[PDB]
DNA sequence: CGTTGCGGCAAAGTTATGGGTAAAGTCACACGTAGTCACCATAATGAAATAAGATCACTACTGGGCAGTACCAGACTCGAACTGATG
């Protein structure tokens with residue numbers, strides 16, 4: 619009906635019967651994620667005060683402690 | 688006198704309403720919302736044009752003066768001659 623990107627919410631999860639390597643990390647600085655986004659905020663210039671559009675934030679996260687590295 | 692129905696009194700029973708606390712749900716993070724014709728009045732030239740103005744050329748009408756002519760004396764000047772005083 620809508621496509622694969624819409625059925626992605628109706629996906630079967632992965633449930634661990636046995637214990638493989640842990641998904642989020644055995645220790646800090648083992649698995650760390652990089653991801654970009656654009657912040658939902660309009661920013662103004664510091665000198666001339668025009669609309670500069672929405673900025674972009676990139677995050678590096680330690681997946682074990684979920685810490686924003 | 689004893690019994691029976693009726694009514695007051697005060698817990699007791701049932702709903703309702705505004706509080707607190709853990710615990711089942713809920714939903715966005717997944718690159719994204721701003722973006723684009725349609726609209727008719729006003730300035731604003733630049734061109735188109737003006738309506739009158741400017742000058743040429745011709746036609747007719749009407750003031751009107753200059754080089755030259757002419758006479759009638761009055762008046763000053765002077766050839767030519769007359770005539771008187773004189774050394």
Ligand SMILES: [Mg+2]
Nearest residue numbers: 653654655718
């Ligand atoms: Mg992203």
Ligand SMILES: [Mg+2]
Nearest residue numbers: 655656657658
């Ligand atoms: Mg977003």
